[PDB]
């Protein structure tokens, strides 16, 4: 996690980098197929290693609260 | 690093060169302007009254 940061920066800074990067690297369910094979390719860019579906999403998550709102309304 | 002797060693750039129009070594090959006759800057020849005493 934020272990590469050693004893530098302090709790919060690296506590958040952890949670954020922890949720960032989890296997995500592709919107296309349903497989948990989505990985980030860069800022806001995600791709499924299974079907190759490349799409946009959050900076650190493939879906954001507001993003999930659009669908509803 | 001192501004004197040690910094004089890094000087190997060519700037002023023989001018095509006036013959002086004042044609700045980077600006493409002669600081002596104005070639590259003006059709008229570079000239100024302060190049001599006021009443002369």
């Amino acid at each position: 996690r934020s272990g590469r940061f050693g004893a530098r920066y302090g709790r919060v800074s690296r506590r958040r980098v952890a949670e954020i990067e922890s949720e960032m690297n989890e296997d995500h369910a592709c919107p296309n197929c349903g497989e948990d094979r989505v990985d980030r390719q860069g800022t806001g860019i995600w791709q499924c290693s299974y079907c190759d579906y490349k799409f946009t999403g959050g900076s650190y998550k493939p879906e954001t609260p507001g993003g999930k709102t659009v669908r509803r309304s | 690093t001192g501004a004197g002797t040690p910094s004089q060693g890094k000087k190997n750039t060519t700037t002023h060169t023989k001018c095509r129009r006036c013959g002086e070594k004042s044609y700045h090959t980077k600006k493409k302007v002669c600081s002596s006759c104005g070639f590259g800057k003006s059709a008229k020849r570079r000239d100024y009254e302060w190049q001599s005493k006021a009443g002369e």
Binding site: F5, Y9, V12, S13, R14, R16, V17, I20, P31, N32, Q41, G42, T43, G44, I45, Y53, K54, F55, T56, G57, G58, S59, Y60, K61, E63, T64, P65, G66, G67, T69, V70, R71, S73 | -
Partner: protein
């Protein structure tokens, strides 16, 4: 004294310019004749140097390949529409008039056909509230109620990249790399830390602004520093 940093800026010298020669494209809406008979296919998702957000490359029916300000949820293969009759789907562009009240939009035009001016940053969105024959009321990201010509075009959905601001930079080096992708002089030396000749707040044994920071709107450049025409300051009251 000497001109302050804010004054060096205006001259637009290299130190203050944005690395434009490195920027990708002007994400303005396509110009349609009419009818909405314009559709394209998302051919690729790219990084946008100027906004730290992703952008989508679209190939339109008539053969035009243009980068697009992509909302969240757009991926390769997906088909997008731009026109009055476009389908009410995330990623499609159409005039506010055709948009159903209560739908989040982005890249909203200020004046019909300008290409989009509002809500273009990471994870933001305007909220279309009211319709009418003469005025479409939109709520912008700052929360302000904006009255727009119903003929102003927008994209349905929120902008891609949301939450980019949730993670701290942690290091000066990270701030550095991002700043090198903008038109900004960084890092920032405090005014109080400079000599009197360089800033209204400079000078004095210990550091401190020898004056109140709230400055008048009418102040001339060189003097207008600190808290510009503040209606109030602090957290209290």
């Amino acid at each position: 004294g000497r001109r302050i940093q804010g004054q060096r800026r205006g001259r637009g010298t290299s130190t203050f310019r944005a690395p434009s020669h490195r920027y990708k494209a002007d994400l303005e809406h396509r110009k349609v004749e009419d009818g909405d008979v314009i559709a394209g296919t998302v051919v690729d998702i790219e990084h946008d140097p100027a906004r730290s957000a992703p952008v989508a490359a679209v190939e339109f029916e008539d053969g035009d390949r243009r980068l697009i300000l992509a909302p969240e949820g757009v991926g390769v293969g997906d088909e997008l529409q731009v026109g009055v009759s476009a389908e009410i789907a995330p990623g499609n562009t159409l005039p506010l008039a055709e948009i159903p009240e209560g739908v989040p939009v982005c890249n909203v035009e200020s004046s019909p056909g300008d290409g989009g001016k509002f809500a273009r940053a990471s994870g933001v969105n305007a909220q279309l509230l009211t319709h009418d024959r003469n005025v479409a009321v939109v709520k912008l990201p700052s929360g302000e109620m904006k009255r727009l010509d119903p003929q102003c075009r927008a994209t349905i959905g929120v902008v891609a990249g949301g939450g980019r601001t949730d993670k701290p930079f942690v290091k000066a080096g990270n701030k550095h790399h991002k700043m090198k992708a903008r038109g900004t002089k960084w890092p920032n030396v405090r005014g109080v830390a400079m000599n009197a000749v360089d800033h209204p707040f400079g000078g004095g044994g210990r550091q401190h602004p020898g004056k109140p920071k709230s400055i008048s709107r009418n102040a001339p450049p060189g003097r207008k520093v600190g808290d510009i025409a503040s209606k109030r300051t602090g957290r209290g009251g």
